[PDB]
């Protein structure tokens, strides 16, 4: 089946342009579909931006007049979005989405790419271990965590033990303050398993090309 994936810069300065790519696999972009760009703002709000269809015909929302171009490269099986004159109001998650031309069926969306429109500087996070206090480790479960502080822009990715530890995890939405984000994640395991089975939070911040693998050490002798 058809699979779509967005790529392109995640941070754009005001008055410049966003330029995104959708790579389609599993289907030729010259057959059957309309290839759409759709964005999502804070609040469940979805806006249809436009399409380029299988023959290269295009259509776009009048809400974007003069600012949008949707194009394709059939040799690469990709289609593209350019949105110029951006402002902070264009900060959104951008999705590519194919729907069949004949009936609107088979809709297939990419994972989405965040585009932040801001003058603020890219900043790598500090990743801090959240080790449980002694008195809260004597029960049958124990909670540990990781604090990802001071980064810009979003996103980060966070896993525990390289993704092998996925149950009992809560990763929270980041909070923004002063053009920097802070995120936390908790993980809960059977207390008898720790510290014999170590626990590491793996954080990546693609925009600064930085990764931190922080092992959580107990408080107390290590």
């Amino acid at each position: 089946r058809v699979q779509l994936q967005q790529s392109g810069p995640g941070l754009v300065k005001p008055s410049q342009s966003l330029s995104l790519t959708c790579t389609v696999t599993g289907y030729s972009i010259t057959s059957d579909f309309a290839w759409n760009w759709i964005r999502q703002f804070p609040g469940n709000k979805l806006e249809w931006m436009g399409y380029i269809n299988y023959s290269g015909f295009t259509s776009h929302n009048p809400s974007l007049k003069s600012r949008i171009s949707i194009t394709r490269d059939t040799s690469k099986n990709q289609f593209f979005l350019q949105l110029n004159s951006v402002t902070t109001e264009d900060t959104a998650t951008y999705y590519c989405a194919g729907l069949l031309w004949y009936d609107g069926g088979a809709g297939s969306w990419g994972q989405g790419t965040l585009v932040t429109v801001s003058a603020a500087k890219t900043t790598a996070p500090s990743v801090y271990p959240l080790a449980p206090v002694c008195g809260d480790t004597t029960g049958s479960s124990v909670t540990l965590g990781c604090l990802v502080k001071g980064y810009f822009p979003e996103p980060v990715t966070l896993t525990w033990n390289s993704g092998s530890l996925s149950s009992g995890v809560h990763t929270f939405p980041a909070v923004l303050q002063s053009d920097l984000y802070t995120l936390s994640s908790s993980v809960t395991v059977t207390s008898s398993t720790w510290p014999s089975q170590s626990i590491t939070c793996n954080v990546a911040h693609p925009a600064s090309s930085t990764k931190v693998d922080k092992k959580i050490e107990p408080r107390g002798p290590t």
Binding site: Y128, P129, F172
Partner: protein, 219 residues
């Protein structure tokens, strides 16, 4: 432009019970060849919207047959015959009959479940952060139901309301609960001045708050 109006804004449903939600369009969506370009989609937490129904009444590819779309003209309905926890999320309608194509504002499906008290955990600043100038104290309030909850921070037994930042997860489909994180940020110097730090959670499972504390400089 066509306005797509969804109701209700939110619905809470017990597992195994039906659900029904409505989408009303400001113009008819039938086209000149007999097709109605009305789709329903579901966006699960942290995912893209995904297909459910298309052509007004047709199950889209691979979608569970528990989902039924009905209606014509301007008034459409999505029914779930029996809700599963993984159905939780925001359901959207979409029209492709009239340019420009437009989406409804979304209906959030919440799962109703038995009350659960939070599990509360408090964490001191890391040594690494204390070498830096700042000090964050973190409290997790995990796996509770229903979703309203309150956290109060105390330093040396006195309430601290400044420097607190909270964040909340969406409902979990695995156990239909909610979780919250609260972080109190101070300067390193203010943290090192005081001794005891306390996170208090008040929730409807108990009449008194759940209290977790630590002393700085004790394990």
């Amino acid at each position: 432009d066509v306005v797509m109006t969804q109701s209700p804004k939110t619905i809470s449903v017990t597992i195994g019970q039906p659900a029904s939600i409505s989408c009303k369009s400001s113009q008819r969506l039938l086209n000149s060849n007999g097709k109605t370009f009305l789709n329903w989609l579901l966006q699960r937490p942290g995912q893209s919207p995904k297909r459910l129904i298309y052509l007004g009444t047709k199950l889209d590819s691979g979608v569970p047959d528990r989902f039924t779309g009905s209606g014509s003209g301007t008034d459409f309905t999505l029914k779930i015959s029996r809700v599963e926890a993984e159905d939780l999320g925001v359901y959207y309608c979409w029209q492709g009959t009239h340019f420009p194509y437009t989406f409804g504002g979304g209906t959030k499906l919440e799962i109703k479940r038995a009350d659960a008290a939070p599990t509360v955990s408090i964490f001191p600043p890391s040594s690494e952060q204390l070498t830096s100038g700042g000090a964050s104290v973190v409290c997790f309030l995990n796996n509770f139901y229903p979703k309203d909850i309150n956290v109060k921070w105390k330093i040396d037994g006195s309430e601290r309301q400044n420097g607190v930042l909270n964040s909340w997860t969406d409902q979990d489909s695995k156990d239909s609960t909610y979780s919250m994180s609260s972080t109190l940020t101070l300067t390193k110097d203010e943290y090192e001045r005081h001794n005891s730090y306390t996170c208090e959670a008040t929730h409807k499972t108990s009449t008194s708050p759940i209290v977790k504390s630590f002393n700085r400089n004790e394990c």
